[PDB]
Coordinates of C-alpha atoms in Angstrom, one line a residue:
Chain A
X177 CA 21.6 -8.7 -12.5
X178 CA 23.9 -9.9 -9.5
X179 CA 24.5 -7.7 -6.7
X180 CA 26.9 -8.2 -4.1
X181 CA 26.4 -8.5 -0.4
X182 CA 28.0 -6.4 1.7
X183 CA 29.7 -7.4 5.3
X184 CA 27.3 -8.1 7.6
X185 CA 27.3 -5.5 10.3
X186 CA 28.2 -6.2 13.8
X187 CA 25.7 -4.5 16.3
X188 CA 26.4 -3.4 19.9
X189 CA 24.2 -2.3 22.0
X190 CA 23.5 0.4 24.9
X191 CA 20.9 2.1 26.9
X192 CA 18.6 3.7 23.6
X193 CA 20.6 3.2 20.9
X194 CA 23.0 1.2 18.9
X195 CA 26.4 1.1 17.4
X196 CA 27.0 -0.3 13.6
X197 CA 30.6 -0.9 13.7
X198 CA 30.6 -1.3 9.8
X199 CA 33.3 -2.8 6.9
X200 CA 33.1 -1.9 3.2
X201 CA 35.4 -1.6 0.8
X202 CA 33.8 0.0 -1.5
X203 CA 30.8 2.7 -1.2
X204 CA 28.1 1.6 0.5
X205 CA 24.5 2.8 1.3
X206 CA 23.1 2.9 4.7
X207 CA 19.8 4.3 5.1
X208 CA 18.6 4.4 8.5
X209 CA 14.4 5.5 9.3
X210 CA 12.6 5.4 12.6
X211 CA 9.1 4.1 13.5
X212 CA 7.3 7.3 14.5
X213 CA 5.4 10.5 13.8
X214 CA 9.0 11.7 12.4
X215 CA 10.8 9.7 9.6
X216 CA 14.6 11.7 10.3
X217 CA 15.1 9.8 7.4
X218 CA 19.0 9.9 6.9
X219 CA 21.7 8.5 4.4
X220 CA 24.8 8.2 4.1
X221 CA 27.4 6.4 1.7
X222 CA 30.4 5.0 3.6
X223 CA 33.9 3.7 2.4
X224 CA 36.0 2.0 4.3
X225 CA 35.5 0.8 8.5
X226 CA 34.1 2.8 10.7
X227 CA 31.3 3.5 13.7
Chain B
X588 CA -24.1 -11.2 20.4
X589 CA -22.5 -7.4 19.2
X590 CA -19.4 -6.4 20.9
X591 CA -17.5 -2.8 20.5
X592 CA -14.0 -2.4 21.4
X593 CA -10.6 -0.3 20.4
X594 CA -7.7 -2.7 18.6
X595 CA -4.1 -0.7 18.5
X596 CA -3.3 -1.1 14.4
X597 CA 0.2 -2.5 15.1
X598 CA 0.6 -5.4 13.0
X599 CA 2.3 -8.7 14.6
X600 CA 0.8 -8.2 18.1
X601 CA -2.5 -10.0 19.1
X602 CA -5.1 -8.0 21.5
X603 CA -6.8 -9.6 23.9
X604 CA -10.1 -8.9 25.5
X605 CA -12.8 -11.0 27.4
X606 CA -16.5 -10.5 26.6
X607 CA -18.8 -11.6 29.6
X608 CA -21.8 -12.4 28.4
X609 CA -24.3 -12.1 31.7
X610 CA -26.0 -15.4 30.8
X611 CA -23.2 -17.1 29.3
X612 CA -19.9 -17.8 30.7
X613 CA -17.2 -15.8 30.0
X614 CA -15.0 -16.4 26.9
X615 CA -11.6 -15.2 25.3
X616 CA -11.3 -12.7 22.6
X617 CA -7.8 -12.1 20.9
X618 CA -7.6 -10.3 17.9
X619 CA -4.7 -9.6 15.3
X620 CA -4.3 -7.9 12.4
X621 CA -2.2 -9.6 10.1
X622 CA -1.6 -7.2 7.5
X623 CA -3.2 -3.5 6.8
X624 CA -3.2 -2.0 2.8
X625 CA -3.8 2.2 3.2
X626 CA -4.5 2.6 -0.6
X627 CA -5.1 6.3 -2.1
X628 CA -7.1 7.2 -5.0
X629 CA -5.2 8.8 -7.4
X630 CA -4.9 10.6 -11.0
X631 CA -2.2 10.5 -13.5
X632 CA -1.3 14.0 -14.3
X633 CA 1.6 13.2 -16.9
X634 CA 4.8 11.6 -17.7
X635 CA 8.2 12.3 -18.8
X636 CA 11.7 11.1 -19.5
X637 CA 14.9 12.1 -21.5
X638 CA 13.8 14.5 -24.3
X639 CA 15.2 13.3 -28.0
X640 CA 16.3 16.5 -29.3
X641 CA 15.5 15.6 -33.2
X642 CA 16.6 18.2 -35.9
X643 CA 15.1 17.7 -39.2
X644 CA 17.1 17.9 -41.8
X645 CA 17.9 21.8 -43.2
X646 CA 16.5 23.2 -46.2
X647 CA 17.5 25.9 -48.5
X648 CA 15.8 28.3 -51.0
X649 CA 18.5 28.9 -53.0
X650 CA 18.0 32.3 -54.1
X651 CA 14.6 33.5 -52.4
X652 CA 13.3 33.3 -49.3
X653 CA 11.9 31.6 -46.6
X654 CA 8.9 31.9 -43.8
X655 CA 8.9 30.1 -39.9
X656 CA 5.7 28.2 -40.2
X657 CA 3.8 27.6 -37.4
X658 CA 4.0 23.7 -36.1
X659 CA 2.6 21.8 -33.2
X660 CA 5.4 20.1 -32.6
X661 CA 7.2 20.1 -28.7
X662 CA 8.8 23.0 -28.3
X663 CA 8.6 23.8 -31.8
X664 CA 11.3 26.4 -32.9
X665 CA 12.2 27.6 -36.3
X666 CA 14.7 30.4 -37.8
X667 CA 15.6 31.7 -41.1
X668 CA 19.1 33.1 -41.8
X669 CA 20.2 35.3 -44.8
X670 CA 22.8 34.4 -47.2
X671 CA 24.9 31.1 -46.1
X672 CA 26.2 29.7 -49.5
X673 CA 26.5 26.4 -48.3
X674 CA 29.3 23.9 -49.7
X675 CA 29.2 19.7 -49.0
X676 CA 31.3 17.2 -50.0
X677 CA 30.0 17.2 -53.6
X678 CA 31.3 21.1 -53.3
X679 CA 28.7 24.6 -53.5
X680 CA 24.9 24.1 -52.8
X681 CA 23.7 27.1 -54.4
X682 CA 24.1 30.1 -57.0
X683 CA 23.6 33.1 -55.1
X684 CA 26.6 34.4 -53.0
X685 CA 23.7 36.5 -51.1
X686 CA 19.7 36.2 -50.4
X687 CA 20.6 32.4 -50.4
X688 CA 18.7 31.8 -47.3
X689 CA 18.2 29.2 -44.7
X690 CA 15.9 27.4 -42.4
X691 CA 17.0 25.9 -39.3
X692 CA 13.9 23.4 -37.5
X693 CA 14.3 21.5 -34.4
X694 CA 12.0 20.2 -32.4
X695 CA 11.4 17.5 -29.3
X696 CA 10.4 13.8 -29.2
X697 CA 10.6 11.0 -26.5
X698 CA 13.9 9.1 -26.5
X699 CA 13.7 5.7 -27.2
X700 CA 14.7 4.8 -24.0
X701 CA 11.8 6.2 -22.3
X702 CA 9.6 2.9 -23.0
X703 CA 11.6 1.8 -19.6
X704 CA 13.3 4.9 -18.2
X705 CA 10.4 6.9 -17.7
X706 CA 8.3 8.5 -14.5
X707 CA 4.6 9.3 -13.9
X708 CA 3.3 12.3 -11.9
X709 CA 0.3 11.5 -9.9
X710 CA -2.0 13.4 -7.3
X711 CA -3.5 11.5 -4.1
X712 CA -6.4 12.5 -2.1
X713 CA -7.6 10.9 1.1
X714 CA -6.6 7.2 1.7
X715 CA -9.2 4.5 2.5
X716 CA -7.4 1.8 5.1
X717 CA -7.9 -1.6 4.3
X718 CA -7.2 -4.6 6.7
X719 CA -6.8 -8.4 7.0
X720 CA -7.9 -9.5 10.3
X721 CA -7.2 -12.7 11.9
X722 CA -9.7 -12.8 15.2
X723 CA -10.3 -16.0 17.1
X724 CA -13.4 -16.6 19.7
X725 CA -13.2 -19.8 21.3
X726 CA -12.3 -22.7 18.9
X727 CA -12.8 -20.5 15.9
X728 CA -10.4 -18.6 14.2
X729 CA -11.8 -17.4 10.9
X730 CA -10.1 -14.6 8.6
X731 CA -11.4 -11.3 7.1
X732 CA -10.3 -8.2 4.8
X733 CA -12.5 -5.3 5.8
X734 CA -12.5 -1.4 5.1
X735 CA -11.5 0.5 8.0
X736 CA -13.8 3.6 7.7
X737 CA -16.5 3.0 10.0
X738 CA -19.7 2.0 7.9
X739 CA -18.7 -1.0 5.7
X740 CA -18.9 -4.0 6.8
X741 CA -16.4 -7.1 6.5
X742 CA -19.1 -9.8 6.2
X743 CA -17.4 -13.5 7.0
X744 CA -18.3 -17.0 7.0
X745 CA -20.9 -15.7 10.0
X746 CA -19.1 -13.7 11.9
X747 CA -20.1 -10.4 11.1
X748 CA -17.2 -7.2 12.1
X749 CA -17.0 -3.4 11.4
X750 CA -14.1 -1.4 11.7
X751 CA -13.1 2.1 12.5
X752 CA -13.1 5.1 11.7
X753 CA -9.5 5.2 12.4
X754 CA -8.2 7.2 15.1
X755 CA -6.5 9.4 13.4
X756 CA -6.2 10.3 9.5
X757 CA -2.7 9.8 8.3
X758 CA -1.0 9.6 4.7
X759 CA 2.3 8.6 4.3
X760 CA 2.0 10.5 0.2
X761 CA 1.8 14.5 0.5
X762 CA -0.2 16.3 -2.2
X763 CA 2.1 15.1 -5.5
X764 CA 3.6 12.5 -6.2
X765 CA 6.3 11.2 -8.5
X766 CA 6.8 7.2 -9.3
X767 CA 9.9 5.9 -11.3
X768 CA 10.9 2.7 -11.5
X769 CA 9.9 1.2 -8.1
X770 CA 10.5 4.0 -6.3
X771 CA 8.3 6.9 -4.9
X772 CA 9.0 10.2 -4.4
X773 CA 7.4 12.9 -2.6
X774 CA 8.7 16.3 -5.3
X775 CA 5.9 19.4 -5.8
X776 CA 6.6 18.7 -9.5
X777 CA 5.4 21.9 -12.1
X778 CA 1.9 21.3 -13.2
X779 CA 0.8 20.2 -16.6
X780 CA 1.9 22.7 -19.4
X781 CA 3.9 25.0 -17.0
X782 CA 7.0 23.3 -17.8
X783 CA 10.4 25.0 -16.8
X784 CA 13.1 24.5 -18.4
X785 CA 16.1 22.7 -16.8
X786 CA 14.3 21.9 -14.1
X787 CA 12.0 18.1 -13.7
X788 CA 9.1 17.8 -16.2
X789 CA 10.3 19.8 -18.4
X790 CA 8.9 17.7 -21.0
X791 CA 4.9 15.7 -20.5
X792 CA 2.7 14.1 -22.3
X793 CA -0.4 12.3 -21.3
X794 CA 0.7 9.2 -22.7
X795 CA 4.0 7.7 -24.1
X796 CA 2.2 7.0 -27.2
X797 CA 0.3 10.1 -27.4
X798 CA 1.2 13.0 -30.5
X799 CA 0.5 16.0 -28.1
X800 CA 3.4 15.8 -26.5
X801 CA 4.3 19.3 -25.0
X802 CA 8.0 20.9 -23.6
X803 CA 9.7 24.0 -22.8
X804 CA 13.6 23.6 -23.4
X805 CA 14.6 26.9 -23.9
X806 CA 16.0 25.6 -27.5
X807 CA 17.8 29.1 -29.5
X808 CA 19.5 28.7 -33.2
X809 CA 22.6 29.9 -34.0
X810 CA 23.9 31.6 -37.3
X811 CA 26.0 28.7 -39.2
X812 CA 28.7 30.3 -39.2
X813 CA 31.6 27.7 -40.9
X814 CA 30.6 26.8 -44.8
X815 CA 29.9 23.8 -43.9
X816 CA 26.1 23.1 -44.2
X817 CA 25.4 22.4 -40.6
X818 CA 22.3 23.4 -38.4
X819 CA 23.9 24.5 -34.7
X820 CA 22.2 24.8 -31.4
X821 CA 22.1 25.3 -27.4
X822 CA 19.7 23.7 -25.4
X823 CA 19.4 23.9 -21.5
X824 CA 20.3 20.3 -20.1
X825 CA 17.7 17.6 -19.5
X826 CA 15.6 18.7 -16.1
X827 CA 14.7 14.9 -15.7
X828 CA 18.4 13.8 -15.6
X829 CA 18.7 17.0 -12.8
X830 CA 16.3 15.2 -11.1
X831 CA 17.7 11.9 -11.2
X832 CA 20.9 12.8 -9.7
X833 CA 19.1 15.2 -7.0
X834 CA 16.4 13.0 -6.1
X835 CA 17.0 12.5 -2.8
X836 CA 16.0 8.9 -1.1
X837 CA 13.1 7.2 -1.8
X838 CA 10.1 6.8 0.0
X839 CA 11.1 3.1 0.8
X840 CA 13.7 4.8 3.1
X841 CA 11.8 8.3 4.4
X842 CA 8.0 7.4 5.3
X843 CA 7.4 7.5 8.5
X844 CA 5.8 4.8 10.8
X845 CA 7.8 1.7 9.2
X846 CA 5.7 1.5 6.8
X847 CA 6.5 -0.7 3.5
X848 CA 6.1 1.5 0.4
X849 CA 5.1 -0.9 -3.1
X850 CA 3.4 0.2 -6.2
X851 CA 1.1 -0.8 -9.2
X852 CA -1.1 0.3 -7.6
X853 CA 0.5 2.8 -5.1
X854 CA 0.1 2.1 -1.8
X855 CA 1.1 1.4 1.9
X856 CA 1.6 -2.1 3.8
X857 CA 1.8 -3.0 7.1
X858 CA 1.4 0.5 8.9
X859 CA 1.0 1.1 12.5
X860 CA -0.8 4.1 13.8
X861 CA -3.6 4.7 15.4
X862 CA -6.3 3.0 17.2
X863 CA -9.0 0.8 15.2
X864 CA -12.5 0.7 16.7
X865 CA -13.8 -2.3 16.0
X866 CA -17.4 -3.7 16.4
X867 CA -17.7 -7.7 16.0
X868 CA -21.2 -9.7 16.3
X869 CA -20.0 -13.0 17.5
X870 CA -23.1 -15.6 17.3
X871 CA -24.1 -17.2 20.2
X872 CA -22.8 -21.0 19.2
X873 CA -19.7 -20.3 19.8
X874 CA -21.2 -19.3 23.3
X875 CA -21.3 -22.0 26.1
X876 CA -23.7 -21.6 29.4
X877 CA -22.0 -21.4 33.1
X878 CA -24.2 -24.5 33.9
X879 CA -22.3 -26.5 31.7
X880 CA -19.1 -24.5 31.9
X881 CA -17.0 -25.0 34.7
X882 CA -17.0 -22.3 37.5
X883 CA -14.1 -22.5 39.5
X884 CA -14.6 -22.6 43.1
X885 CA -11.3 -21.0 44.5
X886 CA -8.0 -20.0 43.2
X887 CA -4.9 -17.8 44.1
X888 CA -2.2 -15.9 42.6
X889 CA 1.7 -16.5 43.3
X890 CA 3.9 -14.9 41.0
X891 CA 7.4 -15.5 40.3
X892 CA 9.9 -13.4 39.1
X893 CA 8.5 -10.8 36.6
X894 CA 10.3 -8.2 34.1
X895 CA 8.7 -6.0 31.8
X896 CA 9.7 -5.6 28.6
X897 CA 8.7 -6.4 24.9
X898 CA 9.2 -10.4 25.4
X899 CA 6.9 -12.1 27.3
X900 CA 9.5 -11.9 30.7
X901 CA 7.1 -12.8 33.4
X902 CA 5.6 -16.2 35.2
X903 CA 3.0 -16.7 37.8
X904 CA 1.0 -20.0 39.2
X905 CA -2.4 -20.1 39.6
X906 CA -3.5 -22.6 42.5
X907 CA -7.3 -23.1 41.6
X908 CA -10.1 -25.4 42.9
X909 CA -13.0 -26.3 40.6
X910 CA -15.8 -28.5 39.7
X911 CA -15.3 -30.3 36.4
X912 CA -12.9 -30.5 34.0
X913 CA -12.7 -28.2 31.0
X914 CA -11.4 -25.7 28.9
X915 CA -11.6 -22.6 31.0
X916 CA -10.2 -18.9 29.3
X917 CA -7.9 -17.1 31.8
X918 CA -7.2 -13.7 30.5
X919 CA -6.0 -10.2 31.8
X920 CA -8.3 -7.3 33.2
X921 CA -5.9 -4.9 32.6
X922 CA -4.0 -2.8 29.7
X923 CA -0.4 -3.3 31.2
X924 CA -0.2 -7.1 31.1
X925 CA -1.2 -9.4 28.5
X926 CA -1.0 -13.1 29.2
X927 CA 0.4 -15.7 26.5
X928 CA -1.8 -18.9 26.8
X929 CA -5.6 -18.2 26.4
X930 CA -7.2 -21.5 27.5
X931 CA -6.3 -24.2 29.3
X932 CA -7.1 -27.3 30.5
X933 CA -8.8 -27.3 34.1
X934 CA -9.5 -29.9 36.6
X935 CA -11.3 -30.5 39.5
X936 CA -8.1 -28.9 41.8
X937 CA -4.8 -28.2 40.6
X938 CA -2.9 -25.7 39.3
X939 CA -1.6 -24.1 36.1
X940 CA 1.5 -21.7 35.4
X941 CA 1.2 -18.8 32.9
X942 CA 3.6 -16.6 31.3
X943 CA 2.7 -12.9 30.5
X944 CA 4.6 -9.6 29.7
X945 CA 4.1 -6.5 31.7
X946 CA 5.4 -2.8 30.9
X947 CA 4.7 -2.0 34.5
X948 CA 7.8 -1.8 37.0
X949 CA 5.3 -3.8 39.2
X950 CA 2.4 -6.0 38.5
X951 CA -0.3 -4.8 40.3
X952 CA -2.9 -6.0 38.3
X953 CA -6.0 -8.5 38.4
X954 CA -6.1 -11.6 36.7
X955 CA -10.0 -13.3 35.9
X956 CA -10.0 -17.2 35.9
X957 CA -13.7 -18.2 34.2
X958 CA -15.0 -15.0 35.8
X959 CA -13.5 -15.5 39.1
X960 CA -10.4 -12.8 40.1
X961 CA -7.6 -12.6 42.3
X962 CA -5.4 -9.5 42.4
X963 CA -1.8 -10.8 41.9
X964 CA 1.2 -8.8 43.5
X965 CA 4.3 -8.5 42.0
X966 CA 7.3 -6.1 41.5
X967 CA 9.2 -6.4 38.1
X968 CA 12.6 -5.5 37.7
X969 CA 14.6 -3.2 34.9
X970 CA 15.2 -5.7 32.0
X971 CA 18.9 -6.4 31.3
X972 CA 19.0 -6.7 27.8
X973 CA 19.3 -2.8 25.9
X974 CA 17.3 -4.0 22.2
X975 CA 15.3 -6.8 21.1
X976 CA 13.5 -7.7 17.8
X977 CA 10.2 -7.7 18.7
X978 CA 8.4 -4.6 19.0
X979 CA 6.7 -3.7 22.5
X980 CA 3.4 -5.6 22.8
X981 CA 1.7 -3.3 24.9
X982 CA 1.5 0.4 25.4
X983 CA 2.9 2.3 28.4
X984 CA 0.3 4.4 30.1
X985 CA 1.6 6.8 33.3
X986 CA -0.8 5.5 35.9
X987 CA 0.4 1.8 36.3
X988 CA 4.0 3.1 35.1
X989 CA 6.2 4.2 38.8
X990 CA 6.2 1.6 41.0
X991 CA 4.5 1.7 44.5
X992 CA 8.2 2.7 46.6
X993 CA 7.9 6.1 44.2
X994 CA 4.3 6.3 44.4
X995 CA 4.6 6.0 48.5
X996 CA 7.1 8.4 48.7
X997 CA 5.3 10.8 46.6
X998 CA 2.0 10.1 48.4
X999 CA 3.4 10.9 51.7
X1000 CA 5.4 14.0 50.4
X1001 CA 1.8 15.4 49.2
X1002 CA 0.3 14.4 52.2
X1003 CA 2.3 16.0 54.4
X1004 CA 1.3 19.4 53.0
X1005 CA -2.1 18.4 52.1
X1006 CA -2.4 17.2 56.2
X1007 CA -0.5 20.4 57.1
X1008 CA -2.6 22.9 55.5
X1009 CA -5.6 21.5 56.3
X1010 CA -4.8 21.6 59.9
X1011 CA -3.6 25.2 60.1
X1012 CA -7.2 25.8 58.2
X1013 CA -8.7 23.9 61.1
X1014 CA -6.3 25.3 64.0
X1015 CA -7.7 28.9 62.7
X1016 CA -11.4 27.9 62.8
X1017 CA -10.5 26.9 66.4
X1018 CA -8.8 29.6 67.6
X1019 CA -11.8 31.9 66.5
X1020 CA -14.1 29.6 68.1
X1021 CA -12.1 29.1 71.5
X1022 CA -12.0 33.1 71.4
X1023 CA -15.8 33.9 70.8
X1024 CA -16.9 31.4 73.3
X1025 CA -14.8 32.6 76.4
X1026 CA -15.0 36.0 75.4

């Protein structure tokens, strides 16, 4: 099946840690996981722009 | 020749290390491990999928009566009502306005869906780590997959390697596990027979093609109440559809250490944790004699600007003076800089720049040149980028981590108590002796 790609996020920086300033119109999954002893495994289905 | 050292398990990052044989001369060692495989063992408990809630057609003893029998089917349930006096479209069933009794059977199979749309419960115990290794000694640079616990060894061409224990036992899969479709999730499913209706599993089997298929769906028979014939029923809602829509992520999304989830068979890619010790017999001919090697006669550190962070954001020039010309190995004596060339060419006198990557706010650290070393001086500054895409090559240890302005000023704020206190200890002691003597 074909599956659409979304926007391609723009990514700004800063001192640990980033901003995804993000554009979708429809729902759209972002699931974000760090590297360590602790997943903090998060998600999150946006609509619209935002940060 | 046996060496024994302790490789980080980060995938993507070469370790470097120089073995000095006493005879021999000295010669590089940088090891990488392309890609690592933690696979579990594991036993399939059961699986289960939308339940096919098949009602066999009703039958009637038209003016008797009737007995529940005793099935194995899953979930089996059976009733017998009194008189119905059922009518169809061809009109009246039956002659007896009373004891014209009825038997209402329903039972559970798999959809036919399930073939596709189905998920398997399965236990794990403790994980053996398997890794490819790429190592390179010298010239050569031979491959290896080898199992990480210590005892086996990963036999090559000749170079003969064993690995681990690891550091530290870790396991991305708790105790049960649940695989659907790709996916992996981490849900205490009910154990085999114990199903719950309503809730996920509430119908297993040990095989999608097996008969003793067993659920618990909380199925109940109604009186028929309209004259009609018609067999009704309530049945609690499909637990594995519950499931579906609160499954939570996947593991692809929630195990920790970055590691890369895939399946058939279950397992876990590319996972960094841990240290691997590692013990590598590298024969001796790859090994070249000093008396044929090159030993440098004199050379000198000068370091330019250095940062540290992940890239490799520092240069220095080696001024060196040798004898012949050949393929000496420079390499790092310490665990906060890592250089990026390995060998290079030397001459009689010349001199060669390097590049390396510190996570030290100062290099203060010695670099060997075909045995010889030279303590470079430098002091690195705060990068100016905020995130790269490589991941940091080298660990940050607290030693070699404040730079020598803090480390001064917090030297001579200690001192100055330490120094204080010893000399009111020593001013006491004097005092007593100054007053016994002339007393």
């Amino acid at each position: 099946c074909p599956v659409p790609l979304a926007h391609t996020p723009t990514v700004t920086k800063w001192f640990k840690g980033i901003t995804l300033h993000l554009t979708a119109t429809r729902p759209t999954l972002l699931t974000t996981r760090k590297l360590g002893l602790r997943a903090d495994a998060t998600a999150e289905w946006i609509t619209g722009t935002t940060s | 020749f046996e060496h024994a050292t302790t490789v980080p398990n980060v995938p993507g990052i070469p370790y470097k290390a120089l073995v000095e044989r006493a005879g021999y001369a000295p010669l590089n060692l940088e090891i990488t491990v392309v890609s690592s495989e933690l696979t579990p063992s594991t036993n399939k408990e059961y699986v289960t999928c939308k339940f096919h809630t098949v009602v066999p057609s009703p039958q009637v003893k038209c003016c008797g009566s009737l007995e529940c029998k005793a099935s194995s089917k899953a979930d089996y349930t059976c009733r017998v009502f009194g008189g119905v006096y059922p009518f169809m479209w061809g009109g009246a069933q039956c002659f007896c306005d009373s004891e014209n009794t009825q038997l209402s059977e329903a039972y559970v199979e798999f959809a036919p869906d399930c073939t596709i749309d189905h998920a398997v419960a399965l236990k794990v115990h403790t994980a053996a780590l398997k890794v490819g290794l790429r190592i390179v000694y010298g010239n050569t640079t031979a491959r290896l997959d080898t199992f990480v616990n210590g005892v086996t060894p990963g036999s090559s061409r000749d170079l003969k390697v064993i690995a681990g224990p690891i550091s530290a036992a870790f396991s991305p899969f708790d105790h049960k596990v649940v695989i659907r479709k790709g996916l992996v999730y981490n849900y205490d499913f009910p154990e085999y027979g114990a199903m719950n209706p309503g809730a996920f599993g509430d119908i297993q089997a040990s095989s999608l093609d097996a008969t003793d298929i067993v659920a618990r769906t909380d199925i109940r028979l109604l009186k028929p109440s309209v004259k009609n014939i018609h067999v009704p029923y309530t049945q609690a809602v499909s637990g594995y559809e519950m499931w579906k829509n609160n499954s939570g992520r996947p593991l692809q999304e929630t195990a920790p250490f970055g590691c890369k989830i895939e399946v058939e068979p279950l397992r876990a890619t590319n996972c960094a944790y841990g240290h691997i010790p590692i013990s590598i017999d590298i024969p001796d001919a790859a090994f070249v004699r000093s008396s044929e090697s090159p030993t440098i006669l004199e050379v000198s550190c000068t370091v330019a600007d250095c940062i540290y962070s992940a890239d490799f954001g520092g240069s220095l020039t080696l001024q060196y003076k040798a004898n012949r010309e050949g393929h000496c190995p420079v390499h790092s004596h310490s665990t906060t800089a890592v250089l990026k060339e390995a060998t290079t060419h030397v001459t009689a006198t010349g001199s060669i720049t390097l590049h390396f990557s510190t996570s030290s706010p100062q290099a203060n650290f010695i670099v060997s040149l075909c045995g010889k070393k030279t303590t470079c001086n430098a002091e690195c500054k705060p990068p100016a980028d905020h995130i790269i895409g490589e991941p940091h090559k080298v660990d940050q240890e607290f030693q070699a981590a404040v730079s020598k302005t803090s480390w001064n000023w917090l030297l001579a704020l200690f001192g100055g108590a330490s120094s204080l206190i010893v000399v009111g200890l020593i001013v006491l002691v004097c005092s007593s002796m100054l007053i016994n003597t002339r007393r």
